[PDB]
Structure 1
């Protein structure tokens, strides 16, 4: 009746880390694809009456991983499991959370679609790390846990950056005001703001060190322009701390010929191959937070 932990095809390293921190090991599931690109999920062990926990990040090929997660949840549910919990470090389609505004002709809400699919597959609980919009919690009818990576970010700032008592935290866009502001309050220091459309700046950032904080980085269209503007303004050096490092498209190329002292990300998305092609990127372990959340859910 105790925890049975399962892992998907994507991001095996974090799954192994979370299993180790729980003093367990991943269950026997073979997730391959048939000849015509159809997902094949075969659970080897018994899940009857167990508290199944599935960890599947929204990275790599998003649709294939999402389909694998749904099929795994359905298979566990039909196999008479007590309660199936889906742990999603990076929620897929989390940037499509609104019907947008004037101009976006009949755009859908893909986040609610994913929520409905997870609910109809048979999920009983959702664990997510640093959702793009905290209001996505309301997209479900089951409990949702929105974990935060801010304590790790503060710890990294304190330990690594020696001048953290006289720095500033800068938001690369207008919507990152809340996160940047909360971090600045936590470190007991001031902050600035940057907006595009071009680049505008409101803050001191003169002969001091600035840290760019954002939730994610897909193509680094942001953060890079913010670093350029900050360097033009008078900043001595610029750091970049991120929660979900996608680094898709050009990305790595842009960081490589950039003046970032360090680009900091977390385990939520595999960074192994990305770190090889870029020395700036550094990784922060968050497996402890997910493991503690899993324990809190399980014991009760």
Structure 2
């Protein structure tokens, strides 16, 4: 049952929490950039005979290179298995072609990762279609219980999804909190703009928890937050699994919301909700 938890640069915080829970020490590569900007890494730890769990996100160019080179480096050891855990899975928003001649980015990248591993897992992937681009079992873990635990003793009247894709998540979270829920219809206009239709639910004087998978520009949370505030909401909590927080996102959100709490899949000052338990449960099931 020997396991090694590899912590890539993007995921030191979550990887450390996972390793601690599992009573093991995180393995980090010796790593640097050559002068020409190529990536170097090395695993001095003897990975022979162990189930290997590589923890790293896959959205930035550097994250991808670190994952790919890690997948080569560990071939130097006769490992028992190689299991990719990408807490935030990059390119999950480009899961099909929207115009002729576009890449299906999550397809080619998933095919690559699955060619070099025995399993892949992520937390709350943007669209499940991508899971079906993998030749190995690609598991979609869920932050639901961690979010419930954070809000167990927080006063909330409704849990709200900003889109129809998030209906199941919020039905589950509200169920577990003994609260009501509804979802908003969303249409994305461009990288930074969305349009919404909010159902005729009376939220006057009500405390709301909005939950989504990703916060990038904050356009989605900002729009839902603003429209709900217009409707008289008294307090709005915002949570998302993956907090990227680019392009003045924090300000856009807090213009109409009160607090932001995301998980540690992407490490930021808002990472108050750890998904370590969910990832450990998965690891124990494999190891």
| TM-score using structure 1 length | 0.86
Deviation, structure 1 residue 28: 5.3
User: Residue 48 and residue 252 in structure 1: after superposition, are their counterparts in 2 closer, same or farther (change >3 A)?
Assistant: same
Residue aligned with 1:93, SS: coil
Q: Distance in 2 between matches of 1:184 and 1:72?
A: 39
In the other structure, the counterpart of 1:248 is: 246
Give me the CA root mean square deviation. 2.0
Match of 2:262 among 257, 261, 265: 265
In the other structure, the counterpart of 1:105 is: 100
Unaligned runs of 5+ in 2: 188-194
- Can you list the C-alpha shifts for 1:79-130, whole angstroms capped at 9, x where unaligned? 3322111111011111111223xxx23222111111111123x211112111
In the other structure, the counterpart of 2:94 is: 96
In the other structure, the counterpart of 1:134 is: 128
| Aligned structure 1 segments of 4 or more residues deviating by more than 6 angstroms | none
User: Residue 176 and residue 288 in structure 1: after superposition, are their counterparts in 2 closer, same or farther (change >3 A)?
Assistant: closer
In the other structure, the counterpart of 1:278 is: none
In the other structure, the counterpart of 1:201 is: 198
In the other structure, the counterpart of 1:290 is: 279
In the other structure, the counterpart of 1:154 is: 148
Unaligned runs of 5+ in 1: 276-280
Q: Distance in 1 between matches of 2:29 and 2:22?
A: 19
Moved more, 43-52 or 192-201: 192-201
Alignment size in residue pairs: 279
Q: Distance in 1 between matches of 2:251 and 2:158?
A: 27
In the other structure, the counterpart of 2:84 is: 86
Partners of 1:262 and 1:282 within 8 A in 2 = no
Within a 5 Å distance, the mapping from 1:59-74 to structure 2 comes to 62-74=60-72
Residue aligned with 2:109, SS: helix
- Can you list the C-alpha shifts for 1:196-247, whole angstroms capped at 9, x where unaligned? 5664321221221122111111110011111111111121121112111111
Q: Distance in 1 between matches of 2:186 and 2:281?
A: 39
Partners of 2:111 and 2:135 within 8 A in 1 = no
Q: Distance in 2 between matches of 1:57 and 1:199?
A: 30
Within a 5 Å distance, the mapping from 1:159-198 to structure 2 comes to 159=153, 161-162=154-155, 164=156, 167-196=157-186
Matched, 1:47 2:47: yes
Moved more, 191-200 or 261-270: 191-200
In the other structure, the counterpart of 1:13 is: 13
Partners of 2:225 and 2:253 within 8 A in 1 = no
Q: Distance in 2 between matches of 1:19 and 1:187?
A: 29
Deviation, structure 1 residue 132: 1.1
Q: Distance in 2 between matches of 1:200 and 1:6?
A: 44
Higher relative contact order (CA 8 A, sep 6+): 2
User: Residue 181 and residue 66 in structure 1: after superposition, are their counterparts in 2 closer, same or farther (change >3 A)?
Assistant: same
